[PDB]
Design a binder for these strands. Structure first.
Ligand SMILES: [Cl-]
Ligand SMILES: [Cl-]
Ligand SMILES: [Cl-]
Ligand SMILES: [Cl-]
Ligand SMILES: [Mg+2]
Ligand SMILES: [Mg+2]
Ligand SMILES: [Mg+2]
Ligand SMILES: [Mg+2]
Ligand SMILES: [Mg+2]
Ligand SMILES: [Mg+2]
Ligand SMILES: [Mg+2]
Ligand SMILES: [Mg+2]
Ligand SMILES: [Mg+2]
Ligand SMILES: [Mg+2]
Ligand SMILES: [Mg+2]
Ligand SMILES: [Mg+2]
Ligand SMILES: [Mg+2]
Ligand SMILES: [Mg+2]
Ligand SMILES: [Mg+2]
Ligand SMILES: [Mg+2]
Ligand code: NA
Ligand code: NA
Ligand code: NA
Ligand code: NA
Ligand code: NA
Ligand code: NA
Ligand code: NA
Ligand code: NA
Ligand code: NA
Ligand SMILES: [Sr+2]
Ligand SMILES: [Sr+2]
Ligand SMILES: [Sr+2]
Ligand SMILES: [Sr+2]
Ligand SMILES: [Sr+2]
Ligand SMILES: [Sr+2]
Ligand SMILES: [Sr+2]
Ligand SMILES: [Sr+2]
Ligand SMILES: [Sr+2]
Ligand SMILES: [Sr+2]
Ligand SMILES: [Sr+2]
Ligand SMILES: [Sr+2]
Ligand SMILES: [Sr+2]
Ligand SMILES: [Sr+2]
Ligand SMILES: [Sr+2]
Ligand SMILES: [Sr+2]
Ligand SMILES: [Sr+2]
Ligand SMILES: [Sr+2]
Ligand SMILES: [Sr+2]
Ligand SMILES: [Sr+2]
Ligand SMILES: [Sr+2]
Ligand SMILES: [Sr+2]
Ligand SMILES: [Sr+2]
Ligand SMILES: [Sr+2]
Ligand SMILES: [Sr+2]
Ligand SMILES: [Sr+2]
Ligand SMILES: [Sr+2]
Lengths: 115, 145, 196
RNA sequence: UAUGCCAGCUGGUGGAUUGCUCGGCUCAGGCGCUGAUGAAGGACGUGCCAAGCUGCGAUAAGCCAUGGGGAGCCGCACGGAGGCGAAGAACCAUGGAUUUCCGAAUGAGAAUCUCUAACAAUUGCUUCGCGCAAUGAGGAACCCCGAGAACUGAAACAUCUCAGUAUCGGGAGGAACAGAAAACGCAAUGUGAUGUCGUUAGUAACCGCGAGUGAACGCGAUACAGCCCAAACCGAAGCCCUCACGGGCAAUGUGGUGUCAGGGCUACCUCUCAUCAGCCGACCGUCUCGACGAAGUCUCUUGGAACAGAGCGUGAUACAGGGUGACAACCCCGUACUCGAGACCAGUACGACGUGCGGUAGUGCCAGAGUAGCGGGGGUUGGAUAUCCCUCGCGAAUAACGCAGGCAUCGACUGCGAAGGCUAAACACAACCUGAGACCGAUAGUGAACAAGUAGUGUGAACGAACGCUGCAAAGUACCCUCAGAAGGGAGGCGAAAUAGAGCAUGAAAUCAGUUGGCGAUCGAGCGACAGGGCAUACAAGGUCCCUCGACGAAUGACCGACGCGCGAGCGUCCAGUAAGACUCACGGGAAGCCGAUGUUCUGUCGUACGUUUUGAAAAACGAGCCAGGGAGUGUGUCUGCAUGGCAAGUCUAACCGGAGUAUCCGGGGAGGCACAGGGAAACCGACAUGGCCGCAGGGCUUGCCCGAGGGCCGCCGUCUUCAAG
RNA sequence: CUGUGUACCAGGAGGGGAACAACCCAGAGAUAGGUUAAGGUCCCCAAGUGUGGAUUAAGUGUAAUCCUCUGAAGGUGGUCU
RNA sequence: GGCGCCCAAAAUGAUCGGGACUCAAAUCCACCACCGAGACCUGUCCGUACCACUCAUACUGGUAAUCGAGUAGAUUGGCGCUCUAAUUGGAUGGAAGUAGGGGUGAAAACUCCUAUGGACCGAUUAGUGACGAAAAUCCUGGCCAUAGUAGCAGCGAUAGU
RNA sequence: UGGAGCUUUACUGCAGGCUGUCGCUGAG
RNA sequence: CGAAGAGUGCAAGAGCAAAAGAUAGCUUGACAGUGUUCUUCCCAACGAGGAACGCUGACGCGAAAGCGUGGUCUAGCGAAC
């Protein structure tokens, strides 16, 4: 039983999208976010660096942390970013919230789920 | 509603037969009783091993992996730039209450680094130099003979 | 030691009675005995406090501060006002008011006094709290946040709470955890609050 | 229909319940010694009438003074009589008077009395005289010094554990104890008296190496403060009593000097401002107590009463709380603001008097002995070779010396001077004062809201209950009748209410009397559930129900008739999946104890309680007479999951500090913990920010093909063991 | 008494078995209509005093299972085929 | 070969459950028709699980021949009690409690009416627990049957009228 | 893997007695 | 003549014939290190002990393949301090 109202709306949004638009990643991300917090992702830059490719939004069904180096110009969408992750990322790419990703890409196309 | 809250009316509160939840017999003895007999399974076996050197004759080195130093070069703008030069002793936390600072070779060194520490590992040198870098021992580091 | 001050003993088997400790023919000590000890009573040793990570708490004070700038939220919480803009900001000279009524006029002029009319109605609670001095309770109304000193002029207003910008807390901004209290900041207080 | 069953009604009994709180329980702040100048405690007295409580002491619920206070008063305790008070009483603060006997109990003795001047007894001083003094005993716990179990844990048990606990003996104070290094030993170019708090840490150490036990240095805080002798060199330069005279002490040393920044002496330099002795003497702050203190008692309605509803109005640096005939900021106390007093801080801080700091050179002048240390035996401790202590025995040096730095010896190095002493502050407790409360609310909460340590039990040590509520106002029932009657009853009076009339708010159940409904003297026992009948029923809070016919019509499913089989009972085919078919609805008619429902009873079907023990319970296994009320997963610390939330290569502060709206809260504090690298007993050494293949989800595409986090299978890397290898 | 495999009782209602933990039917939400199962159809008690035929005269018998329902060795010009 | 007969004795009253039964109401061989569960079939509803839609675990629609018994135990939603807070209500035009009665809910329980009572009482949300009794030869208090019953006689002191 | 009383050449200890030795403890 | 009735240390069952038995000769593998697997403990966790099977070292015998990690196999065994 999530207690955070925001995480709760974000989930309702992801669903509305996956159902209305051609989403599936969004419904897949909502699925995981509905599971308990220990299962949510905690990803450091190093991993996003190792598997991300330009022109393919990285979607982390959790929170992005700041260990390691990110040089690729990638747009990372996540539930949250640590103050440092958002900073290190903005230097080479763009950090956006899933609320925005669903906004520009309700069809959830050209995306890479990273955990 | 919690388990506890649902117990009224149950009589045994989950203990099974009411002849169960009595004294230490239901636990096979108090504390670790039977650790070498009935409740012997999954217990470090009985024994006496090794020895300990006196605490004031022990040395605690402060260590750091190249990977940590390398991943933060540019970030360490407050730590020299030449043909980067870094005095580890000024990077590693816990360096005061430590006998000496040692650089370990875990990870990659994607830069030309000139490192200054009291000690390095064979692999730490190989990596730093292999990147056109150098390694310099402190005067304390002179205790390497 | 309540209920334990007795040498009462149990005869045991023999006289057709349950094995209950008795003294002078009256049962004692045991929990099922009238005048007996309390089996699992309230304990002094119990830690009745709650820890709160400073970051989590500061985030709550800021989140409560924000709730203040939402007239809809504020109206939802229950307050009775007639403005569109909230929080209500006032001239630093507010801090110089001395008479309570000088503040009433200002609140009427600001169409905020209705909330005080709301608090001007105490409730006589149901239950024994009254026997312990908790006979009354009243609605929470306007919170005045100044910066130099808590407004002595406003504090006595029905349900009014006065606070200073450097230490105004979550309970001030959200009485009982209910976000969106009808606030009125002082121009200077408004600024100091920016860095909490 | 007697005896009787079930339910209800009226009235009892009972005292649950609801409401109320003069008492508790807990936390917080403050404050903190009494006694031979006879305490604490106890006994016995003491009032106009006086048994209990409280007070007081032959001056006896009191006497005196100063201040406050004020028209009233004579305690709890609402009676009667009488008295006191403007000669200012009561009442309160402070100070004083009186203060029987027993009691440390002290002239001797004694169950609170007696017998013939008394510090008894032990001491110090001593005018050697009890002349001057001291000790004694009490106190809620706290504190210091000694003596010191067992149940228990180890699933037995002896070491160990419980535990240096319970308990015992001695003793101090408002706090105790400790304390200015023969320290520490992050070993150092380092710290710098002592407690305490947080941490270091369940680490080191102990241990049938089992169960278990368990520090320190340091660090962060709190608070901070350092000094005095013995001796050397001086040698009566001195101290105590007394007004004095005079006496006592003191060469076995009073007094000066000095005290590891060693000192002394000799010779110089310079200087005072250290220290020590003594004088003056707070601010502020905290606790408590006290003075002052705004604004409605307006209208209408209801009511026994307005603090209610409706309307009009007002204060607020005061909308805490209480009282008042019902919900009150504005009726009364008080509360905010402001002010005063006492106590504590504290005889402290500051200031001031006196004194004199310190430094050079020479000088083997001085510097605590049954000690340091060793051995025999024990205890204790984490103390292990390396804790601390007791006991028996042995036993050194002299600063050019000695001790310590976790086995012993020798050297080096570093630290430090034991065997004499004092010392504020920060910390414990809770008698006492005040405050507070998500504590209890009269079988609770104290044993105790009441007569409470009461009544009562025991030879004694000791043990030990129960009892709260009339009313707005006693208006607490006049008069009358009855009666043996200050009884009780009837009538009457008061009041909103006497079904508020004395354990007198409310008034449950068990249960009792009377009575209503149903059953009832030919009939059968888990007392019922379900269905259907009888009889019973004021309203209200439920309004449905019955009968014709008609519509719909699941599974199922015919009679009759016709034809054809069978020895026969009977069957087959067609009629026909038709008529019929539960429920539901519509039309028409009807019911008002009528339908539901409730009570009881009758009929039918099923049925030998409930809880427990048990393979098996109606059990001839266990428990309870009945009812009400009471009656069992709670706390701390540690560990390990889990859900949610913050932050994230980090994360969290602890003690504590500042602020403030003063236990909350805002800010500060990262000491330290866990995480960020492991392997090894140790020495010591020290890793994949990805190299390959599968492939879920998801993405892409030209729809089987790519990309494929996570995951899966391998490689390789660190280390231990290793002639390698494994 | 002690094994083993299995289904049942325990922890399993409801229908039957006179009653009856584990034998038979049967595994069961509520309510309703219908048709069966085991087992029954002379009465008690729902359904036959059913049909064709045989045997038995002992009240044999009207008793699946069973601690529970007995009936044996030995015999029988009882009677039927 | 079928049925039967002898063999064949037990303690309070005989038995196939009983009555009772003889071309049977017995036994055996065939057959015919019926009775009889909660099983099976059928209508409606409930719960649960899964599906579709959805923010929803709220509605709505759909699927269940292959869902519907349960001791010990595991898991989850909900009822009720105390006091705290926030939000918001009721009460002298009569609160709580109690008695009798009506309505809802599978249920814990909720609610109304009448009488009594005569002053306090809730709801929602978040908390807080000395939070629920039919049982312990459980405790304390009260009360009934026992019962107008036993005793009020017995002793070397029969005591009276 | 209850308790207590009692027993003994049960296990383990503790008083007590005997005996040696050191101190007290000295001269030839 | 004779597949095995002998012998093979010891219970019992099992194995063995140009041998696993007998005789002769030679030899010390009854060796060191480290594992895999099974067993102990079916299924299914549990130690010591055991066995089969590897890798490395050093050896013996043999022409050599090969055999030898004790006696043909299943008993002959023991934690911490
Ligand atoms: Cl990562
Ligand atoms: Cl219907
Ligand atoms: Cl529990
Ligand atoms: Cl529910
Ligand atoms: Mg255990
Ligand atoms: Mg009690
Ligand atoms: Mg209440
Ligand atoms: Mg034990
Ligand atoms: Mg102390
Ligand atoms: Mg043991
Ligand atoms: Mg130390
Ligand atoms: Mg009591
Ligand atoms: Mg009464
Ligand atoms: Mg059972
Ligand atoms: Mg019939
Ligand atoms: Mg017979
Ligand atoms: Mg609300
Ligand atoms: Mg109860
Ligand atoms: Mg009788
Ligand atoms: Mg014994
Ligand atoms: Na007592
Ligand atoms: Na506590
Ligand atoms: Na005091
Ligand atoms: Na004398
Ligand atoms: Na039992
Ligand atoms: Na039973
Ligand atoms: Na029986
Ligand atoms: Na009785
Ligand atoms: Na005994
Ligand atoms: Sr016990
Ligand atoms: Sr063992
Ligand atoms: Sr640190
Ligand atoms: Sr007995
Ligand atoms: Sr200091
Ligand atoms: Sr000395
Ligand atoms: Sr040494
Ligand atoms: Sr009582
Ligand atoms: Sr006695
Ligand atoms: Sr009358
Ligand atoms: Sr039809
Ligand atoms: Sr922090
Ligand atoms: Sr991988
Ligand atoms: Sr018939
Ligand atoms: Sr017939
Ligand atoms: Sr026939
Ligand atoms: Sr029998
Ligand atoms: Sr038989
Ligand atoms: Sr026979
Ligand atoms: Sr069910
Ligand atoms: Sr079920
Ligand atoms: Sr099931
Ligand atoms: Sr309880
Ligand atoms: Sr009686
Ligand atoms: Sr007589
Ligand atoms: Sr007699
Ligand atoms: Sr072999």
């Amino acid at each position: 039983s999530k207690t955070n109202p925001r995480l709760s709306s974000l989930i309702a949004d992801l669903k509305s999208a996956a159902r209305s638009s051609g989403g599936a990643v969004w419904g897949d991300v909502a699925e995981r976010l509905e599971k308990p917090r220990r299962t949510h992702a905690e990803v450091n830059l190093g991993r996003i660096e190792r598997y991300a490719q330009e022109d393919e939004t990285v979607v982390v069904p959790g929170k992005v942390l700041g260990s390691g180096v990110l040089q690729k110009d990638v747009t990372v969408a996540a539930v949250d970013f640590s103050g440092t992750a958002e900073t290190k990322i903005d230097q080479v790419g763009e950090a956006v919230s899933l609320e925005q990703a669903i906004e520009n890409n309700p069809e959830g196309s050209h995306v890479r789920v990273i955990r | 509603t919690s388990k506890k809250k649902r117990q009224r009316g149950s009589r045994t509160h989950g203990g099974g037969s009411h002849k169960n939840r009595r004294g230490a017999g239901h636990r096979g003895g108090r504390g670790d009783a039977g650790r070498d007999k009935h409740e012997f399974h999954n217990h470090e076996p009985l024994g006496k091993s090794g020895f300990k050197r006196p605490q004031k004759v022990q040395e605690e080195a402060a260590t750091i992996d190249v990977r940590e130093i390398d991943e933060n070069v540019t970030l360490l703008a407050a730590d020299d730039v030449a043909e980067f030069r870094v005095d580890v002793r000024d990077v590693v936390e816990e360096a005061d209450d430590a006998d000496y600072v040692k650089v370990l070779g875990a990870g990659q060194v994607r830069h030309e680094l000139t490192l200054i520490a009291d000690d390095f590992s064979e692999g730490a040198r190989e990596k730093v130099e292999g990147a056109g870098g150098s390694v310099e021992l402190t005067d304390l580091g002179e205790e390497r003979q | 030691y309540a209920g334990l001050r007795t040498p009462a003993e149990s005869f045991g088997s023999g006289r057709g009675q349950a094995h209950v400790p008795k003294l002078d023919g009256r049962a004692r000590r045991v929990p099922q005995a009238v005048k007996g000890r309390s089996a699992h009573p309230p304990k002094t040793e119990k830690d009745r406090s709650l820890d709160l990570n400073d970051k989590e708490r500061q985030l709550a004070v800021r989140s409560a501060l924000a709730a203040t700038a939402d007239a809809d939220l504020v109206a939802d919480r229950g307050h009775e006002f007639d403005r569109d803009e909230v929080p209500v900001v006032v001239s630093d000279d507010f801090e110089d008011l001395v008479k309570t009524q000088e503040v009433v006029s200002l609140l009427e002029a600001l169409d905020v006094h209705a909330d005080i009319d709301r608090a001007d109605e105490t409730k006589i609670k149901a239950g024994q709290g009254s026997a312990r001095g908790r006979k009354y309770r009243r609605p929470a109304s306007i919170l005045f946040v100044t910066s130099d000193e808590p407004s002595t002029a406003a504090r006595n207003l029905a349900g009014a709470d006065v606070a200073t910008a450097s230490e105004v807390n979550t309970e001030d901004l959200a009485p009982g955890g209910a976000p969106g209290r009808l606030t009125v900041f002082t121009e200077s207080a408004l600024a100091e609050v920016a860095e909490r």
